[PDB]
Design an enzyme around this catalytic site. Sequence first.
Site, PDB file in Angstrom:
ATOM      1  N   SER A  13       0.831  -1.195   0.000  1.00 17.46           N
ATOM      2  CA  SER A  13       0.000   0.000   0.000  1.00 17.46           C
ATOM      3  C   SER A  13       0.871   1.253   0.000  1.00 17.46           C
ATOM      4  O   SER A  13       1.589   1.505   0.977  1.00 17.46           O
ATOM      5  CB  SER A  13      -0.888  -0.008   1.240  1.00 17.46           C
ATOM      6  OG  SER A  13      -1.617   1.197   1.309  1.00 17.46           O
ATOM      7  N   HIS A  33      -1.311  -1.305  -4.274  1.00 14.22           N
ATOM      8  CA  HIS A  33      -2.570  -0.921  -3.642  1.00 14.22           C
ATOM      9  C   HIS A  33      -2.621   0.583  -3.379  1.00 14.22           C
ATOM     10  O   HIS A  33      -1.728   1.143  -2.727  1.00 14.22           O
ATOM     11  CB  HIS A  33      -2.764  -1.707  -2.351  1.00 14.22           C
ATOM     12  CG  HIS A  33      -4.102  -1.496  -1.720  1.00 14.22           C
ATOM     13  ND1 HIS A  33      -5.232  -2.181  -2.115  1.00 14.22           N
ATOM     14  CD2 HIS A  33      -4.491  -0.670  -0.721  1.00 14.22           C
ATOM     15  CE1 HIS A  33      -6.255  -1.800  -1.369  1.00 14.22           C
ATOM     16  NE2 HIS A  33      -5.833  -0.883  -0.515  1.00 14.22           N
ATOM     17  N   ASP A  83      -4.769   3.630  -1.774  1.00 13.49           N
ATOM     18  CA  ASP A  83      -5.811   4.011  -0.810  1.00 13.49           C
ATOM     19  C   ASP A  83      -6.253   5.449  -1.063  1.00 13.49           C
ATOM     20  O   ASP A  83      -5.579   6.393  -0.641  1.00 13.49           O
ATOM     21  CB  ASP A  83      -5.309   3.837   0.616  1.00 13.49           C
ATOM     22  CG  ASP A  83      -5.252   2.391   1.020  1.00 13.49           C
ATOM     23  OD1 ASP A  83      -6.290   1.705   0.889  1.00 13.49           O
ATOM     24  OD2 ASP A  83      -4.163   1.919   1.397  1.00 13.49           O
ATOM     25  N   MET A 109      -8.640   8.596  -0.597  1.00 12.88           N
ATOM     26  CA  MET A 109      -9.468   9.164   0.463  1.00 12.88           C
ATOM     27  C   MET A 109      -9.807  10.607   0.126  1.00 12.88           C
ATOM     28  O   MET A 109      -8.917  11.380  -0.239  1.00 12.88           O
ATOM     29  CB  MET A 109      -8.699   9.119   1.785  1.00 12.88           C
ATOM     30  CG  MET A 109      -8.265   7.725   2.178  1.00 12.88           C
ATOM     31  SD  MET A 109      -7.460   7.742   3.784  1.00 12.88           S
ATOM     32  CE  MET A 109      -6.597   6.167   3.746  1.00 12.88           C
ATOM     33  N   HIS A 130      -8.513   1.294  -4.029  1.00 13.49           N
ATOM     34  CA  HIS A 130      -9.515   1.208  -2.975  1.00 13.49           C
ATOM     35  C   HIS A 130     -10.063   2.616  -2.752  1.00 13.49           C
ATOM     36  O   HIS A 130      -9.353   3.492  -2.240  1.00 13.49           O
ATOM     37  CB  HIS A 130      -8.844   0.637  -1.724  1.00 13.49           C
ATOM     38  CG  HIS A 130      -9.678   0.702  -0.486  1.00 13.49           C
ATOM     39  ND1 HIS A 130      -9.152   0.414   0.758  1.00 13.49           N
ATOM     40  CD2 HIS A 130     -10.987   0.981  -0.291  1.00 13.49           C
ATOM     41  CE1 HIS A 130     -10.102   0.546   1.669  1.00 13.49           C
ATOM     42  NE2 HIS A 130     -11.224   0.892   1.063  1.00 13.49           N
ATOM     43  N   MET A 182     -12.061   5.124  -0.809  1.00 12.45           N
ATOM     44  CA  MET A 182     -12.686   5.577   0.432  1.00 12.45           C
ATOM     45  C   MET A 182     -13.172   7.002   0.204  1.00 12.45           C
ATOM     46  O   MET A 182     -12.621   7.986   0.716  1.00 12.45           O
ATOM     47  CB  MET A 182     -11.687   5.497   1.578  1.00 12.45           C
ATOM     48  CG  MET A 182     -11.445   4.068   2.050  1.00 12.45           C
ATOM     49  SD  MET A 182      -9.853   3.888   2.850  1.00 12.45           S
ATOM     50  CE  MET A 182      -8.797   3.921   1.400  1.00 12.45           C
ATOM     51  N   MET A 197     -11.799  -4.883   5.524  1.00 13.83           N
ATOM     52  CA  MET A 197     -10.945  -4.053   6.360  1.00 13.83           C
ATOM     53  C   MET A 197     -10.766  -4.706   7.727  1.00 13.83           C
ATOM     54  O   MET A 197     -11.752  -5.018   8.409  1.00 13.83           O
ATOM     55  CB  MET A 197     -11.575  -2.677   6.561  1.00 13.83           C
ATOM     56  CG  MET A 197     -11.777  -1.875   5.304  1.00 13.83           C
ATOM     57  SD  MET A 197     -10.235  -1.609   4.424  1.00 13.83           S
ATOM     58  CE  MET A 197      -9.186  -0.950   5.720  1.00 13.83           C
ATOM     59  N   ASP A 257      -7.075  -5.821   4.375  1.00 11.93           N
ATOM     60  CA  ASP A 257      -6.291  -4.588   4.475  1.00 11.93           C
ATOM     61  C   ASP A 257      -6.378  -4.077   5.912  1.00 11.93           C
ATOM     62  O   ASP A 257      -7.489  -3.786   6.371  1.00 11.93           O
ATOM     63  CB  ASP A 257      -6.951  -3.590   3.508  1.00 11.93           C
ATOM     64  CG  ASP A 257      -6.268  -2.234   3.435  1.00 11.93           C
ATOM     65  OD1 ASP A 257      -5.238  -1.998   4.092  1.00 11.93           O
ATOM     66  OD2 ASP A 257      -6.801  -1.389   2.677  1.00 11.93           O
TER      67      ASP A 257
HETATM   68 ZN   LIG Z   1      -6.980  -0.070   1.100  1.00 11.42          ZN
END
Ligand SMILES: [Zn+2]
Lengths: 224, 223, 224, 223, 223, 223
Positions: free
Chosen positions: B7, B32, B34, B36, B65, B67, B136, B178
């Site tokens: 990540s 990966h 993340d 946000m 991913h 979020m 998660m 994750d």
């Molecule tokens: Zn993630």
Amino acid sequence: AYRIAPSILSADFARLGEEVANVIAAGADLIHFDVMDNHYVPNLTFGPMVCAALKPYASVPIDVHLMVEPVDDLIQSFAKAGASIITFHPEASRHIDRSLSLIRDMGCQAGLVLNPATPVYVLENVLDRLDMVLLMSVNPGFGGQSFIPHTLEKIRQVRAMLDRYEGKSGRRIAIEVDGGIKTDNIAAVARAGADTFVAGSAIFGKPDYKAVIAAMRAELEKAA
Amino acid sequence: AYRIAPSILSADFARLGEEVANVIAAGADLIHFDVMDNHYVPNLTFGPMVCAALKPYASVPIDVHLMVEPVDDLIQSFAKAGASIITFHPEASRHIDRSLSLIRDMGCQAGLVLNPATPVYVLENVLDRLDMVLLMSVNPGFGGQSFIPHTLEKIRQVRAMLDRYEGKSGRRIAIEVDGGIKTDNIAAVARAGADTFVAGSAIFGKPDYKAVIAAMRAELEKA
Amino acid sequence: AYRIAPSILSADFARLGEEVANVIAAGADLIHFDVMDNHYVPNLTFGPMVCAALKPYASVPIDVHLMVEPVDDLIQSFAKAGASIITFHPEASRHIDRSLSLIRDMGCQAGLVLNPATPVYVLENVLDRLDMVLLMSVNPGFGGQSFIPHTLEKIRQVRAMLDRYEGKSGRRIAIEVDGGIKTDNIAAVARAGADTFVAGSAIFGKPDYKAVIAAMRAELEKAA
Amino acid sequence: AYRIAPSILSADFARLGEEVANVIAAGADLIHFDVMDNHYVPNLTFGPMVCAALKPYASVPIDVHLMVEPVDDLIQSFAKAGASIITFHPEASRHIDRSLSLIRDMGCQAGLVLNPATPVYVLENVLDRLDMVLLMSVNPGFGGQSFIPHTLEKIRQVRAMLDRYEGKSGRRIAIEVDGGIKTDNIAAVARAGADTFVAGSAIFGKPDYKAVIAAMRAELEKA
Amino acid sequence: AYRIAPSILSADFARLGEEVANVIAAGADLIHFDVMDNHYVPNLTFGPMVCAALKPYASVPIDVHLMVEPVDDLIQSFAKAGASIITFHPEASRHIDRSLSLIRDMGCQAGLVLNPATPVYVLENVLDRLDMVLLMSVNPGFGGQSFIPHTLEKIRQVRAMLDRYEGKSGRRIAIEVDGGIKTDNIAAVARAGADTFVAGSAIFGKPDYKAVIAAMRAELEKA
Amino acid sequence: AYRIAPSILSADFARLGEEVANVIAAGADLIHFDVMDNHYVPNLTFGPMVCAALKPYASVPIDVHLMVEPVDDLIQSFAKAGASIITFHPEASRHIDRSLSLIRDMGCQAGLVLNPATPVYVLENVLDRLDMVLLMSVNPGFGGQSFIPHTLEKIRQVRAMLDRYEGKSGRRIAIEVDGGIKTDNIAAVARAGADTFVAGSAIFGKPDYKAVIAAMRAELEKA
Ligand SMILES: [Zn+2]
Ligand SMILES: [Zn+2]
Ligand SMILES: [Zn+2]
Ligand SMILES: [Zn+2]
Ligand SMILES: [Zn+2]
Ligand SMILES: [Zn+2]
């Protein structure tokens, strides 16, 4: 003194430390950080951890432009990540005076940003809170757009307001402009009254940052 | 085969291309991402232009991913920026089926993410839309947190659901986890039924990514 | 042990300290605080400064029910104001597990609230985070409403889930019910499996709190 | 006449009826209610049931300041609960003119509130709807803050606008100020052109409300 | 040249094509569409599919007033559905200049709407983007309301601003007014400086649209 | 008794009264109204004034499907406009039980709608409040989409739940399905357990509504 603030929105995000070092070597006065949360503008860019990661490379101040809503949490996180200047849009905070006070209380210079449509009168009751006013010459969200000609009149209006304020307070508030600034128009922007110039695509989109910044400096010598 | 997905939330953002190249050299199967937006979670990370900038360095697939809320605009922009897998949280989309369909229509593998509290039953009506389920094991938003032990039971529950679905459809949906995955717990996560393991701080926070990934591989051999 | 939790939503807000003292003198086990922000429910009640003001009068624990969205800021403020228990609605927090963890990290007992329509399965992945489950037997927002009969089945379902969890963990999670609880129905609510009973209008709407609570205790002796 | 409006935000919420009675005994002209919904400002205070509970104790008018968004439902409920004056922030209502009209249609005096940054020009198209303008001399949300000096210039600007309006309409709109008002600055606020003064901590934070209000009255005699 | 723009908000929605044809036969210059999303205003009216269905009947331009938030998606769908003019409220778009530019880039004339309380200064930095300014003389949401007298002063203020802009640029921006316009007040609205007049209940609520529009024309000839 | 509910979303909005009369002449049992506010779904359709305008033409009940958020204000206005049935999505109301109770208290039959991804368990605690359950077989927002095959399994699951409830209570809750229903698939939808069938494009997109509805009836007689 005129300041040139390259905008990393247009840089190579795979080599951001090198990009920052190279634009500083080319004469950058500030590193401009366009922060977008996909809500205040229809794009998502980079958060405070990117600012923290570039702090060791930034031997000049980091200028954070928040295109986010709300603003107070990211004011705090960007200050802690090493920002020197933080600006935000008045429409994005319910309590503009509080948000500007918070920026200074976190140790940073504080400013407000005017979208193309935003009237200048939004500044008149917070002049004592301001270190800088940023006028957008494009609609925020994206680099590579074209400078909106009416911005020149707005810059003149803000400069007149800030000249009168300096006469009363002895404080000079800086005027920054962001959006489609190029070597071929920077002199006009300075003549209108601005002193700090954000440029992304005109610098990072070219192979030689030293040549671009030097050409901008030469045009600014004509405005002076 | 087990997949290890470092990540970049935990990587050096001043040298992201080198970081991606180095973790691929160490055996990464996926990169990966993340993502946000400061609204679905209380943090703001990186948008599609960062994905596009890393595409030339990513010789393995990019696993995004989301979020964020809402999700459909960023599904499209991450797909255009070179993502291979896109996952999002069902709570973040009013029309979950539409959003999953959009991911596949953009050319990507599609998945849903379960927060620690999110029940597994939210998956039962979209199995035909899913290529992966991400569980998660921490509350999303931050790296470096500790694996929530109850996640092992949820992994087992999801694996049982997906085993039954494979029996009916012949298609295997992958299970990713994750949050706080480390060398010393990765075998337990695999034994519970997961096959794809996201790790940020355990890899990027260490000096030799090759050593960490090899050590994770050795533990997975015991699973 | 059964707990009776009078709800100050139905009390005289001009004499709140006296009301709290009088209901404690009548046998209250908890003081129930219905916090509404006009967004999660269509009513606005009272904030953390009211909790702080009543802390010196509350010789029994204060049980704060948050009907607000989002929840984490008010979790912190109510904990600092002296709450002992804090509950909130899972629909009101994007990160339910984080919010429950925060309640305990602030030193309080933590719980989730189920609206009439909310399925019990929302509890199944956070049992280790829970000290209490509150089932609403009315739609949140207002006192004086009538107990929804289907709540009895939901209480039985939650009790069965919590009995199985206690068998595995040795921890007993409490079951609270809020909405139209009266002397004439409290025994049925206990028989369904609840142990903590919130009542507003049935207590504060009557002249003698001692008589009401004693009558509730006598009915609970029948359920046992 | 100058009006002093003690703010119950700073009072003892365990004995609110006594607090209201005592400040009225000390010379209060209005009871000021700071209503916060945790959305328009980062604090949550008290709703209409508190207003209703205090109505039998309030022999002077109740002045409700709504720091809430949106506003129309609470305008109605506070009017029904016995408010005499209702003010709100223009930024909090999509239809400011409608909201001001609603206040008067519910039987109450209507006003707008200016945050420190809010320009005065937001008032210029609703003067016929206004009974009062409230200028915040602090950022709304909390008592005990310090008066922002620039507020004096804004008060002068509003008073000039309202003087011109009275010349045209014959009707005088009142000017209220809220935030850090103390005995030692109240005269300056009056000289700038205000006529109604909200004070919380300076009154309720002191042992003798009679002494504080009398001292404020003595300073207002100098204005 | 004065334009009369009947507002279909007051028409018979069971016979909309006939209503449009009949008001055009009566002398309508535009068909005014009041689009409400139940969010920017407390009412829900009609979407782009209704505009598309009326396009074959509209031999005069369709004027779409968006009382929605946000605006950009509906700008695009109304343009594709055949709108000629699209106006929206500045408060409803975070990026007003972008939204106005989008209207023109979709091939339509662009405008901004001023609610009764909205200051005219919101127009001063987008004059190059504007083809029309609409001033609401009622609070948007409903037909059949009464004209707010202060609107006349705002119309005069906008006309002076637009007159100065026409002198600088050579471009004449139109001024439209919407809300309680009747035969008995239309001359005063024109004298204040407006040129385009939206009327709903005064036209569609009467049995003979030809008679009403003719009567309005006669009052305008006196203006 | 199977009910066919033509969806006016696919009708000619310039001649809505004729469309309603013609589909009733063809055998329609309900008139289905797809109400969209551009927030719960990415489309805006028609509000309560359209329902009111069609009430004189609707000799069969009007079935209002609210794809809006929040719901309670429009529940009230559609009831007052003559709706007979009102359904909404549980995700769109914070207080689902209150909203369902309000529908009945306004004199209407009440229902909940399940999006493709929405689990059936959302119904289990409000069965006493329900007169109908609508299952979407497409993602709401648009007509002309293709029936999602997994819907058949969900219909079976809902029918089993409602069968058990009818045994306990004696009350039969109806099952409606909306999305891509055609003559060629209606029998399968009925066999899965549904009794009320919404169809838009299959009816209104054809020249002879009598022929389509008769053909649907013939397939249902085989179911
Ligand atoms: Zn993630
Ligand atoms: Zn910028
Ligand atoms: Zn409660
Ligand atoms: Zn106040
Ligand atoms: Zn209009
Ligand atoms: Zn429908």
